[PDB]
């Protein structure tokens, strides 16, 4: 006996797979189950199965001024069993945040901004009183089931004059709160990237690692990986794509790629703006763009689903693994053309598409 039980799966190694489900987690994973169930899905030949996606790199708090979007619009609906908001909100507005969250299908996790209105301004880091390590502190002994880290947007609108401070108070705040994960945003400068790499160890989250401007890893005179930025990464600070609507270069993406670098997670700095209008529609389209800068699909699915859940403990989740939760992506990959646009406005053609066409979520299952 299985609550749930999905058949005629494949994983995107072409690895024969069916799942049994019950009391909303994985009771069961090989190649054939034959066992009885409330429900059998019966999947068509040549649908690949995969851990529930997973973005870490979201902006859903719907009451947000600008920066905002509804949590199943980029969930759920686009075979994304799990998100991550990325410091929409501080310690001041997480918990309005948090009550909403719990109303969407799609699982919703958040990082609480250091700053304690979160992004309210456009430089919520230019005013350090804003900035209190208590209020922090307490919104991650007040939610522990919601707050997986903490962000810290480290670019020249965001810090105002205060420079690389900002940073130096968000890593002090994590070991005041027992290592928690930190993701840190990079773009113009001020603050040097160099100084930020510095600061930054192993398990940290660089999002936006990508990013075609001229404060990222490329240098744009030798058009090549500066070496501080091969020290960060090979240190093991977690590359994290974060598209967004300026932090996607196709260039920067190649050329690290030829020099043997990839990205650990792919996420989409996606908001209602940029998925409406693009650059970034969803996380689908954002993994075809990896395809076409050189990744093969099983590493793909396996950097929005495991490296994601590895990054913030989501102990629970991003694996086929029995005892964890029931979180699945069903989905196609097919050949057809399609234009691809990153942040600069570069463009490619994709050759692959891939589509989820089935979400189970905690169990659910939901079409499309
Ligand atoms: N991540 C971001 N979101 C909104 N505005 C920005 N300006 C620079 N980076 C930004
Ligand atoms: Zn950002
Ligand atoms: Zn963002």
């Given at each position: 006996?299985?609550?749930?039980l ?6 995107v190694n ?7 489900i019950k ?8 190649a ?7 429900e ?13 996606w997973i973005?870490?790199?979201?902006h ?21 069993t799990?998100?991550?908001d990325?410091?929409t909100t ?16 799609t ?9 304690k ?22 919104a991650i ?19 105002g004059d ?50 075609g401007?001229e ?27 974060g598209?967004?609507t ?5 260039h ?29 529609y ?11 800068v ?12 495991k ?14 693994e029995?005892?964890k ?5 069903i ?7 399609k ?22 979520i905690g169990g ?5």
């Amino acid at each position: 006996d299985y609550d749930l039980l999905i058949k005629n799966g494949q994983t995107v190694n072409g690895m024969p797979v069916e799942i049994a489900i019950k009391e909303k987690k994985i009771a069961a994973v090989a190649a054939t189950i034959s066992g009885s169930a409330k429900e059998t899905i019966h999947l068509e030949p040549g649908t690949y199965v995969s851990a529930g996606w997973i973005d870490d790199h979201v902006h859903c708090f719907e009451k947000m001024a600008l920066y905002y979007d509804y949590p199943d619009e980029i969930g759920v609906k686009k075979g994304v069993t799990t998100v991550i908001d990325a410091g929409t909100t501080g310690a001041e507005n997480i918990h309005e945040f948090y009550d909403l969250a719990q109303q969407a299908k799609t699982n919703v996790f958040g990082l609480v901004n250091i700053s304690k209105w979160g992004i309210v301004a456009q430089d919520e880091l230019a005013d350090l009183s804003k900035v209190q390590a208590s209020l922090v502190k307490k919104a991650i002994q007040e939610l522990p089931d919601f707050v997986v880290g903490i962000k810290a947007r480290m670019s020249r609108t965001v810090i105002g004059d205060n420079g690389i401070t900002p940073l130096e108070l968000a890593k002090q705040i994590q070991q005041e709160n027992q290592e928690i994960p930190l993701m840190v945003h990079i773009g113009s400068a001020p603050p040097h990237l160099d100084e930020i790499l510095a600061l930054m160890e192993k398990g940290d989250v660089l999002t936006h690692c990508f990013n075609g401007k001229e404060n990222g890893i490329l240098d744009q005179a030798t058009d090549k990986i500066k070496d501080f930025a091969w020290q960060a990464y090979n240190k093991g600070v977690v590359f994290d794509i974060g598209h967004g609507t300026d932090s996607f270069n196709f260039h920067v993406a190649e050329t690290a790629l030829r020099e043997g670098m990839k990205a650990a997670s792919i996420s989409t700095d996606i908001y209602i703006r940029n998925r409406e209008n693009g650059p970034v529609y969803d996380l689908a389209t954002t993994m075809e763009k990896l395809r076409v800068v050189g990744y093969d699909w099983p590493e793909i699915i396996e950097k929005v689903t495991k490296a994601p859940a590895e990054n913030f403990h989501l102990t629970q989740k991003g694996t086929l693994e029995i005892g964890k939760d029931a979180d699945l992506t069903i989905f196609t990959i097919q050949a057809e053309e399609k234009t691809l646009t990153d942040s600069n406005g570069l463009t490619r053609v994709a050759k692959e598409q891939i589509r989820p066409i089935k979400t189970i979520i905690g169990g659910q299952i939901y079409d499309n």
